[PDB]
Design a binder for this molecule. Sequence first.
Ligand SMILES: [Cl-]
Length: 209
Amino acid sequence: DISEPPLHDFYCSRLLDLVFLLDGSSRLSEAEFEVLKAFVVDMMERLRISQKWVRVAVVEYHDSSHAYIGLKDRKRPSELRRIASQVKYAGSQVASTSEVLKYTLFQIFSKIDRPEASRIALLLMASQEPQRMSRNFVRYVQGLKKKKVIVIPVGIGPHANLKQIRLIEKQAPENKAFVLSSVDELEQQRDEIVSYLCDLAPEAPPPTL
Ligand SMILES: [Cl-]
């Protein structure tokens, strides 16, 4: 038994696999990265986290991707939120969006054994990868598109890869971007982002018998 009641009245109770992808570069200071994690935790509090409802994954990406939470991890929501809150600051020279989308496509959504859930990757971006790393970027985004993995880029600050964000937006109509000036704007956009992605996901049918 690992179920927990909602903390808030605002609560997504739909069939959803939601992946948080966190920029691990030094474009975010340690303090800004704490705000980014607080946003992720705030969003998690507003999800009904359960294998039967909303599943979550949390990945920090630098030149490679490090998963802290996988969709299949059967832990209490509060423990998942604690894990997210403690994601270590990397401050890397490089954060590769191409590598983390590859990770999402071939490690997270490799095997679609939950066909009843919508699949969304929230790509929190504050930087630009070296162009040498981007050869397959469009191919991974298209691979995700074909598995109906909706990619929602959140561009934070002026160093965010806006060219890639626009590329993501054009691959699928549901791939909506949120472009923010700084991590301090995350809190005021949070419930709008939650509502947008909740609306994308299927409802569970009314309980019977
Ligand atoms: Cl009934």
